[PDB]
Tab-separated table of C-alpha atoms and ligand atoms in Angstrom:
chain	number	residue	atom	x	y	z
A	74	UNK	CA	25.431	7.145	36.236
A	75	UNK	CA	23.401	3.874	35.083
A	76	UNK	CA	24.858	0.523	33.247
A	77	UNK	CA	25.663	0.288	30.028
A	78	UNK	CA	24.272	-2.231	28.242
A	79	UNK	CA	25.994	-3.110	24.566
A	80	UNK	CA	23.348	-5.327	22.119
A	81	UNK	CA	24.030	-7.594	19.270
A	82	UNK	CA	22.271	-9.371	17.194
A	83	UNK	CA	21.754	-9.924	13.060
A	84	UNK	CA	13.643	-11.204	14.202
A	85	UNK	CA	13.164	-7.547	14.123
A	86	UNK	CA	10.036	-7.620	16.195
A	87	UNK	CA	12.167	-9.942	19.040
A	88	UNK	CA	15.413	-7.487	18.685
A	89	UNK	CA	13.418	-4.584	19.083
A	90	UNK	CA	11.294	-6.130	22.100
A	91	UNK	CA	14.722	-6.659	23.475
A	92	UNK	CA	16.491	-3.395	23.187
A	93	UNK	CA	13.290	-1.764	24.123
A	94	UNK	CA	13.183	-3.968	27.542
A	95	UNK	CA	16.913	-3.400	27.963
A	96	UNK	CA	16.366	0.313	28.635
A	97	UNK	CA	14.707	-0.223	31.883
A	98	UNK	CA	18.483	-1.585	33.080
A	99	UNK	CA	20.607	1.150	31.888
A	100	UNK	CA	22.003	2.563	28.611
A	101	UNK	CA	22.238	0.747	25.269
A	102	UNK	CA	24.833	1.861	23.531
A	103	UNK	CA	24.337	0.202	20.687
A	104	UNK	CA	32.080	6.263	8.007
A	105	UNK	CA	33.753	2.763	6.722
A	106	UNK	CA	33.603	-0.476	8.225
A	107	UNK	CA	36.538	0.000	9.716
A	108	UNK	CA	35.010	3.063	11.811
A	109	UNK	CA	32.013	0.925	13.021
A	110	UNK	CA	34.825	-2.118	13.924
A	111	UNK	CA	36.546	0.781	15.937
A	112	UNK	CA	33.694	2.364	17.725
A	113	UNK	CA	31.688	-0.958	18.369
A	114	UNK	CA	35.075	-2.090	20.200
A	115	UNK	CA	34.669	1.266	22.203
A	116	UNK	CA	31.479	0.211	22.889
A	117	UNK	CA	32.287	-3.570	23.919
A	118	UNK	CA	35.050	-2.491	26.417
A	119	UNK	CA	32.547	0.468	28.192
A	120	UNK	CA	29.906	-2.395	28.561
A	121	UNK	CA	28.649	-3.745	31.941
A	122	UNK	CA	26.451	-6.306	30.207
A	123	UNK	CA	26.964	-7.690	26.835
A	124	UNK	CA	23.897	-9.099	25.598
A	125	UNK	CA	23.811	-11.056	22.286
A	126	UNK	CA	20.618	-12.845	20.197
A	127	UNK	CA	22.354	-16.180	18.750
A	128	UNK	CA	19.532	-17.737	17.029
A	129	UNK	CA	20.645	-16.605	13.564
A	130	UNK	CA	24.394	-17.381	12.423
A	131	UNK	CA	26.412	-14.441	12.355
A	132	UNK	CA	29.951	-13.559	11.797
A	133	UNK	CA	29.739	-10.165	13.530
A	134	UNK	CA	27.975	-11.645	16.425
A	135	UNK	CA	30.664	-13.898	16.891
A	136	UNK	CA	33.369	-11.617	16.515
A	137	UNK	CA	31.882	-9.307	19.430
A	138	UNK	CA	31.404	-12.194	21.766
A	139	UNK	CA	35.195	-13.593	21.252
A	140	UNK	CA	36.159	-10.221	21.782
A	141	UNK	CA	33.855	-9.781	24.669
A	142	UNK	CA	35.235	-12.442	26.334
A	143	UNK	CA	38.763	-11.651	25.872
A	144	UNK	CA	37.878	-8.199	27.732
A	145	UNK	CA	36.721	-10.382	30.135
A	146	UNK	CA	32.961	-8.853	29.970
A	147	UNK	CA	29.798	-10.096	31.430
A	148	UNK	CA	27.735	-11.722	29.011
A	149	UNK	CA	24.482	-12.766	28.219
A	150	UNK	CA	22.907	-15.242	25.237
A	151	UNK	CA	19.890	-15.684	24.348
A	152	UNK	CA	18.977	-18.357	21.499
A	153	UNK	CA	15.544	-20.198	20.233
A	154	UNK	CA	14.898	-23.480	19.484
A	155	UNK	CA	12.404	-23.007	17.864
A	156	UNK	CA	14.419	-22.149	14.914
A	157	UNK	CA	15.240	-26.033	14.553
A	158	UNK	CA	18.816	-24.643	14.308
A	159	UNK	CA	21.379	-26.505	16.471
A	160	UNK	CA	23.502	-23.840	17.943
A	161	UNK	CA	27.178	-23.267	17.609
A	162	UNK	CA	29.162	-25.471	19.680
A	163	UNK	CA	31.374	-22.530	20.284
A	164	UNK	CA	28.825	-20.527	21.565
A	165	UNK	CA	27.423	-23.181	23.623
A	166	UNK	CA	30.290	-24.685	24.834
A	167	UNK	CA	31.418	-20.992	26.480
A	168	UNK	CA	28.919	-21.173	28.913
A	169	UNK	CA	30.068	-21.273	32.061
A	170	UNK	CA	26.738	-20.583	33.775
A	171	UNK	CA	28.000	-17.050	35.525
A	172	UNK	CA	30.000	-14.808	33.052
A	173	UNK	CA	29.326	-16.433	30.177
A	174	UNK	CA	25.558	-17.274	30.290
A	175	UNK	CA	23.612	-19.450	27.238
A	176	UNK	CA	20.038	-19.313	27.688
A	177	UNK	CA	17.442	-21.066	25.444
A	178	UNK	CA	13.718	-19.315	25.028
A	179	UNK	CA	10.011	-19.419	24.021
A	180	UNK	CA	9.321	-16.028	21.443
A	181	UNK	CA	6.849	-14.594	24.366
A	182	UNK	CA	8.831	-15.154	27.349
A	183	UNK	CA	11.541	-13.000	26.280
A	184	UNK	CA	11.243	-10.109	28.953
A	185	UNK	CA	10.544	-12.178	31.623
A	186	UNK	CA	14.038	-13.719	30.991
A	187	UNK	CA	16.113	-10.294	30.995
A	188	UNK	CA	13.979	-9.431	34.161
A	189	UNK	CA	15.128	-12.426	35.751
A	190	UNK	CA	19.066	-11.893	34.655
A	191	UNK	CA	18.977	-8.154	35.373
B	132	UNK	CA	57.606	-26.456	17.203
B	133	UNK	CA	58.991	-27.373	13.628
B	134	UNK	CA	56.675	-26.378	11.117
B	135	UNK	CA	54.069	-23.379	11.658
B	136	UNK	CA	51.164	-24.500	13.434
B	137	UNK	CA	48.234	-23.596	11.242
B	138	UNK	CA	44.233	-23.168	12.461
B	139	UNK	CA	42.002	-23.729	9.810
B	140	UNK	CA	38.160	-22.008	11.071
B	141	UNK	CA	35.145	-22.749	8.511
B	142	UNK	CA	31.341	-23.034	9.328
B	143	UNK	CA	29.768	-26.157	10.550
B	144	UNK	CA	26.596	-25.328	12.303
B	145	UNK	CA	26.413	-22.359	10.699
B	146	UNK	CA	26.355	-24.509	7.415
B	147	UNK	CA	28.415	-27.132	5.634
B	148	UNK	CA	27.596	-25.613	1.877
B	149	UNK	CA	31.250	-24.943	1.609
B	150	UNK	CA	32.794	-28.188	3.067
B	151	UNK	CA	34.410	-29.230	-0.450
B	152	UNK	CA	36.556	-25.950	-0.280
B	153	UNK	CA	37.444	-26.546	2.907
B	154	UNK	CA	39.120	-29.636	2.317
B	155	UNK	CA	40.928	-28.063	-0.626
B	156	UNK	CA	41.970	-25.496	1.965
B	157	UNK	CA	43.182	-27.867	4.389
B	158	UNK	CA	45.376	-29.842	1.702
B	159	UNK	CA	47.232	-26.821	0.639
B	160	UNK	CA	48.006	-25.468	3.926
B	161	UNK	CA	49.251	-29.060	5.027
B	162	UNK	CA	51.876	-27.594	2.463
B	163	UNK	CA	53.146	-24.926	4.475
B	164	UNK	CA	53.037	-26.108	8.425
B	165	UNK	CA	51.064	-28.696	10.785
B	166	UNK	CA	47.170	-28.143	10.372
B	167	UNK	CA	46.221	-28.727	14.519
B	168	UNK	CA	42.124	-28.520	13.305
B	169	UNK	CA	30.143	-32.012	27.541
B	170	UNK	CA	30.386	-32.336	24.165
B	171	UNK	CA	29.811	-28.559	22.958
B	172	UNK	CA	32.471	-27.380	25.959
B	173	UNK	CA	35.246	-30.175	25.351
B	174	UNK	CA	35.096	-28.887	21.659
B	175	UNK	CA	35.640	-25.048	22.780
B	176	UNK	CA	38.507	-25.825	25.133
B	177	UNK	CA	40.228	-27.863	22.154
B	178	UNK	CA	39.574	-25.304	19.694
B	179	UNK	CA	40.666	-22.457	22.235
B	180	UNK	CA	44.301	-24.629	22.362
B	181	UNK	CA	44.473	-25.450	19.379
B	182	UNK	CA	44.167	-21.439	18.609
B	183	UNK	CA	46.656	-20.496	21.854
B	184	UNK	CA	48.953	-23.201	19.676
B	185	UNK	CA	48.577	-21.546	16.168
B	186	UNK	CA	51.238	-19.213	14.529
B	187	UNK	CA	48.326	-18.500	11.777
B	188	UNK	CA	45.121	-18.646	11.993
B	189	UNK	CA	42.907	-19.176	8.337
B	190	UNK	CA	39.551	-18.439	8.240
B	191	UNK	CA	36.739	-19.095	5.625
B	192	UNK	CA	34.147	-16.150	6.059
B	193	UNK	CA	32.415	-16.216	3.101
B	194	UNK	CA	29.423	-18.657	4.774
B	195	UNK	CA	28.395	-16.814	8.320
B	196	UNK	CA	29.150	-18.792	11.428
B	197	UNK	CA	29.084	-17.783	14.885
B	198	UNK	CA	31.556	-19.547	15.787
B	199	UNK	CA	33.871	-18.504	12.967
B	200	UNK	CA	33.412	-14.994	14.061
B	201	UNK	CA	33.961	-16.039	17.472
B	202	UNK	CA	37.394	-17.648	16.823
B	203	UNK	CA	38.675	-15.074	15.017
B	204	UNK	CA	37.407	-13.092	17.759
B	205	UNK	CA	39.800	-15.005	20.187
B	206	UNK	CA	42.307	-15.457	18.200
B	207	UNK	CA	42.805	-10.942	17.624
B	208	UNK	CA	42.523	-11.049	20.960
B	209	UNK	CA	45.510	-13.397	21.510
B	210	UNK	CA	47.341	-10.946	18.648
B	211	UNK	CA	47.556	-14.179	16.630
B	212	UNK	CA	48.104	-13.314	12.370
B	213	UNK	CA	45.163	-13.923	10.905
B	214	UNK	CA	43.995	-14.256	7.429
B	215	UNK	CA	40.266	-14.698	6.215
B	216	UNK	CA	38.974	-15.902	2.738
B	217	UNK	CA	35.877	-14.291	1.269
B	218	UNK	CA	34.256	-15.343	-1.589
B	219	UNK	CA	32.475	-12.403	-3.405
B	220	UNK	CA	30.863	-14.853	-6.177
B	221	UNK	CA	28.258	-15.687	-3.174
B	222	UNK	CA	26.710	-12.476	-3.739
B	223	UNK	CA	27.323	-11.957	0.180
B	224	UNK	CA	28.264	-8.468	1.745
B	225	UNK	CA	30.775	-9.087	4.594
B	226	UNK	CA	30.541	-8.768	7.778
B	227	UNK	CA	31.670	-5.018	8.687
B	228	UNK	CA	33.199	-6.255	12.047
B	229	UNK	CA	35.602	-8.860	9.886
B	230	UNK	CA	36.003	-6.439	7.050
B	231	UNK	CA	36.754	-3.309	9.537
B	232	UNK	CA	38.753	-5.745	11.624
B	233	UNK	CA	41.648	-5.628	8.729
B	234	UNK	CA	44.645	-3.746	9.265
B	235	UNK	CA	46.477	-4.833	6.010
B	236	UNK	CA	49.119	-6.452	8.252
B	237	UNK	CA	48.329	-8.852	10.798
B	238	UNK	CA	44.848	-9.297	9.831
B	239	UNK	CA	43.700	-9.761	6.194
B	240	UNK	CA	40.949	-10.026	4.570
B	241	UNK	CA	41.078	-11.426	0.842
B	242	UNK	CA	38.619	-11.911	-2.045
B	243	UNK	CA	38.893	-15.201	-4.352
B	244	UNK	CA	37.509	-16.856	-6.354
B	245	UNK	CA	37.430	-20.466	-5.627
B	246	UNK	CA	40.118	-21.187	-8.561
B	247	UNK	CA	43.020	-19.453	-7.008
B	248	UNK	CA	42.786	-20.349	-3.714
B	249	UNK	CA	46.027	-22.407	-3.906
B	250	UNK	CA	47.598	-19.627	-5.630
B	251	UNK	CA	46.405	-17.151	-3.077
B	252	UNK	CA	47.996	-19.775	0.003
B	253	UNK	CA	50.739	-20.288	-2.024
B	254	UNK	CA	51.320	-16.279	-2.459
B	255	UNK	CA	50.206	-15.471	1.862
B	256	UNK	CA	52.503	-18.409	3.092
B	257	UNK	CA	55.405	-17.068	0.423
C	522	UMP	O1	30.842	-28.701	16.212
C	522	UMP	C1	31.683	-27.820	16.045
C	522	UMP	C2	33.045	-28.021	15.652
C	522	UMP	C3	33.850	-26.960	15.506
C	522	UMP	N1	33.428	-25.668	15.710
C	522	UMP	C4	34.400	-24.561	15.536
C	522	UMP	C5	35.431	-24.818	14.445
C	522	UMP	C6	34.868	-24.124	13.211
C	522	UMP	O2	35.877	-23.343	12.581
C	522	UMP	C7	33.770	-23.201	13.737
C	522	UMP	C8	32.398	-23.463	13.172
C	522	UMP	O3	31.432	-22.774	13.987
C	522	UMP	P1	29.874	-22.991	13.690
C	522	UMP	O4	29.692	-22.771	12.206
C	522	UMP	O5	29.582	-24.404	14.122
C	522	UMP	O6	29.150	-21.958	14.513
C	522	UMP	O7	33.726	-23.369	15.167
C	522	UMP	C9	32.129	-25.398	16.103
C	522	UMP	O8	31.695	-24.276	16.310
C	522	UMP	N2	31.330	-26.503	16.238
């Protein structure tokens, strides 16, 4: 009955302001490891909106945006300079400006940014 | 083609720390097949041919890298056999999403130490 929203991210504070903001949008959905691999992949493919934070390097992160792509999902990236990190050229170079959006941000402007997407 | 078309993935932006080994890598597995591995796009649409190209695809996950994960990402997704290299010397706990992504088969996931890791290629590629 609402969207589902599916997070990721590896900056506790900023993924917490995040998820928190998400929530007025839909549903977040977001043993063994292969049990989490399996239900996060439920997850992925139920997703309207998958939303990532890129900022810090992440193999998981990764993983759930290549397969978010391949199922051909909505998704949305969110990265600061700030960090002084240059970001993955993978990641960067995916954005297509529509499905597959890359957007750099200031710490504070953060909901303002997911207000403007969603 | 003639030879197995091999894609070797290892972090860059994530971090070069373990660019030594990954030249080690690359000479063994030039062994066994051909090694195929705007500017941020014309490098994704290379690397995404390269991996639609690959019969293998190798992966060093010990160092985290977006874009690591996000090949190998792709390259389940294209049902290519994969096989990732962890190092558990780094005092690093893998990803669950790369270690749950192992089925034993098709995808593998195997600790080394940085010794063996021509014996291990040697041993995959047998
Ligand atoms: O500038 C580059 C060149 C290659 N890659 C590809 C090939 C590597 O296997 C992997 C490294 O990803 P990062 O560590 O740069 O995120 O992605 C990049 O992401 N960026």
């Amino acid at each position: 009955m609402r969207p589902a929203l599916y997070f990721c991210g590896s900056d506790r504070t900023l993924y917490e302001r995040i998820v928190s903001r998400l929530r007025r949008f839909g549903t977040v959905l977001t043993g063994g490891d292969r049990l989490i691999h399996e239900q996060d992949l439920e997850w992925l493919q139920q997703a309207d909106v998958v939303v990532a934070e890129v900022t810090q390097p992440s193999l998981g992160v990764g993983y759930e945006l290549g397969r978010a792509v391949a199922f051909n999902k909505r998704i949305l990236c969110l990265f600061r300079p700030q960090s002084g990190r240059v970001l993955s050229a993978m990641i960067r170079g995916a954005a297509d400006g529509s499905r597959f959006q890359v957007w750099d941000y200031e710490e504070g402007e953060v909901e303002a940014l997911l207000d403007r997407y969603f």
